[PDB]
Amino acid sequence: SEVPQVVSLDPTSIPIEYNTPIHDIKVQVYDIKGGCNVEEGLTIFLVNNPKENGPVKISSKVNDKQVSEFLKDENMEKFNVKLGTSKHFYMFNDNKNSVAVGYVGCGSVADLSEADMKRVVLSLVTMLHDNKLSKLTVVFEINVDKNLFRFFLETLFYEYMTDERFKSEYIKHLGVYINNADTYKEEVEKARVYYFGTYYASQLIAAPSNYCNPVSLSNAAVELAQKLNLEYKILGVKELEELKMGAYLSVGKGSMYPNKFIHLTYKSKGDVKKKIALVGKGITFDSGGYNLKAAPGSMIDLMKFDMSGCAAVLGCAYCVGTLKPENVEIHFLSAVCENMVSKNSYRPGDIITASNGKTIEVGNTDAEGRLTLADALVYAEKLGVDYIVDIATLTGAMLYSLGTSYAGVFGNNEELINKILQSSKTSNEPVWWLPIINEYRATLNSKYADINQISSSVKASSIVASLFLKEFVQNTAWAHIDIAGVSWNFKARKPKGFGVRLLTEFVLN
């Protein structure tokens, strides 16, 4: 519980905003039939041309003569639909009120992907950050299913919100016009919950390691649990020693922060039909240890992001605790520690013993996440659960296989993997199934210990890491999502909060 300091200026908690300006936005959805009113603020048409870089045409009736004139085909023809392109103009409407009207081009393909919709939303937010506005109205002249509509709102909220916690006027109304509006209305408050879970995960990830350490991260988790009435248990070093979690404890040996193991539980009021464990990797800073991250491209400056899997799991607890699904029991776990260089650190070649009795030869101290996950998986399996799903920024190799856009899913059970893929489709957080190739298993055969931590011949590191983790799950359906490539948004210089909505869709559906 008390956060240790080196000097009295060392922070002792992670600052967290709960009530955000997004929560004060009043949202109304109207049917397009009947016409759009243009009375105040900024009005944006979402427009495609199914062709390439083709002209903007507005098909919706607008109940304002001045604005209709501006929106005539002969004027809008000047502008083109290239994806993410935008224009907006201030003008007087019929009431001589000054209103801003424009568009964001949605390209020439009728079904937009999640990536295309993010580009549309980015261009919208750029206008929001550049204009003082009480109101934004968005007119849909593109087709969107209910899930993609929800994703439009969650991304708009997340991208719009600015995190100012470490620095020393938002709209108050959102109108949406869309054909068959009544079917979309239910998505609004679901989007607002999914926004906050994602935004909350992002806050934990962006919090630097001096603020977000194993003690302060577990304290934040207890505070979350108290606000949502979840049960919670934080296991400290003496308890972890009794549980014999030698793999996880070895990783944290060189840190000034004691290991803390987070275990939150949501349990439905009714019968419990399904029991799930969600396991997040929780390394609050990864130096690499004695295998220090010193090579070109190692990015040691990004390594506060190595607890992103723990953050996604706590963002999912927010969503779950809020929307309150029936018939389930969810355990949210995370073996939290910090990987540092010290006279007290574990070393390359050390032989260590996991909580299931397996001895492990450490070949590289910067493969610490699979060690802390090993003992977390043994813990999760002893809970007697139906599914275990871990999420982790585990292998740099992911940037060379799927890149920055799709996470990789690996698993021991095809039904569970298909469930994750489905949740990927409905959360619009993209994941792709990659294989656990059994032919590589013999590279983990240690001359001295029961098993090696790493391969010294196989380059397919993300597959080798998966084979290692699978050794710690005996008889339960298990899937492992590797988000090393997708967790950080390099262009925007901030986290994605990747996985909160994926994991929540999985629990809910």
Q: What's the rounded Cα separation, in Å, for the pair 215 and 149?
A: 39
Residue number with the shortest CB distance to Zn ion? Answer: 286
CB 22, min distance to a second copy, A? 19
Q: How far is the CB of 440 from a second copy (least distance, A)?
A: 6
Q: Which does 113 bind (CB under 5 to 8 A by kind): Zn ion, a second copy, none?
A: a second copy
369 contact, one of a second copy, Zn ion, none, CB 5-8 Å limit per kind: Zn ion
Q: Which segments of 302-448 are extended strands (E)?
A: 328-339, 351-353, 359-361, 387-392, 407-411, 431-433
Q: How far apart are CA 182 and CA 32, in angstroms?
A: 11
The 139-178 site mask, x for binding a second copy (CB under 8 A), equals: ------------------------x-xxxx----------
Kindly give the residue spans of alpha helices, DSSP state H, lying in 181-298.
187-206, 214-227, 237-242, 246-252
Binding to a second copy, residues 416-435 (CB under 8 A): 432, 434-435
Please give the single-letter amino acid code of residue 366.
D
In 3D, which of 407, 401, 404 has the Cα closest to residue 421?
A: 407
DSSP H helices in 105-212: 114-128, 146-160, 187-206
Active-site positions?
293, 370
Closer to Zn ion by CB, 116 or 482: give it: 482
Residue of the chain from 64, 141, 306, 390 that contacts Zn ion (CB under 5 A) = 306
Three-class DSSP labels, 387-427: EEEEEECCCCCHHHHCCCCCEEEEECCHHHHHHHHHHHHHH
Could you tell which of a second copy, Zn ion, none binds residue 306, using a CB distance below 5 to 8 A set by kind? Zn ion
Query: Vertex 260, ends 255 and 261: CA angle to 5°?
Result: 135
The backbone region for 13, taken as left when phi is positive above 0, alpha when psi lies in -120 to 50, beta otherwise, is beta
Please list every residue from 36 through 55 that binds Zn ion, using CB under 5 A. none
Q: Residue 100 forms beta bridges with which residues?
A: 42, 90
Longest dimension (CA), the chain: 84
Question: Taking CB under 5 A as the rule, does residue 390 contact Zn ion?
Answer: no
DSSP H or E segment with residue 317:
helix 308-323
Binding part of the chain for Zn ion, among 242-250, 324-332, 361-369, 438-446 by CB under 5 A, reads 361-369
- Terminal alpha carbon distance of the chain: 36
Look at residue 1 and give the partner it binds from a second copy, Zn ion, none, a contact being a CB closer than 5 to 8 Å depending on partner kind: none
What residues form the annotated binding site for a peptide?
281, 286, 293, 306, 366
436 binds a second copy (CB under 8 A): no
User: Which residues, numbered 256-295, are part of the site for a second copy (CB under 8 A)?
Assistant: 256, 285, 287, 290-292, 294-295
If one asks whether residue 402 binds a second copy (CB under 8 A), the answer comes out as yes
CA gyration radius, the chain: 25
Find which of a second copy, Zn ion, none residue 341 binds, CB within 5 to 8 Å per kind: a second copy
Residue 42 contacts a second copy per CB under 8 A: no
Applying CB under 8 A, does 346 fall inside the site for a second copy? yes
Q: How far is the CB of 421 from a second copy (least distance, A)?
A: 12
| Pair of tokens at residue 421 | 């893929």
Our finding on whether 369 is near Zn ion (CB under 5 A) is yes
Q: Could you tell me if 427 and 496 are in contact, meaning their C-beta atoms sit under 8 angstroms apart?
A: no
Main-chain phi, psi angles of 7, to 5 degrees: -135, 165
Name the segment binding a second copy (CB under 8 A); options: 5-13, 18-26, 148-156, 419-427. Answer: 5-13
Choose the binding region for Zn ion from 10-18, 222-230, 278-286, 316-324 (rule: CB under 5 A): 278-286
- Annotated binding-site residues read 281, 286, 293, 301, 303, 306, 366, 368
Binding residues for Zn(2+): 281, 286, 301, 303, 306, 366, 368
Residue 244 interacting with a second copy (CB under 8 A): yes
Residues between 15 and 34 that touch Zn ion (CB under 5 A): none
Catalog residues that contact Zn ion under the rule CB under 5 A. Answer: 283, 286, 306, 369
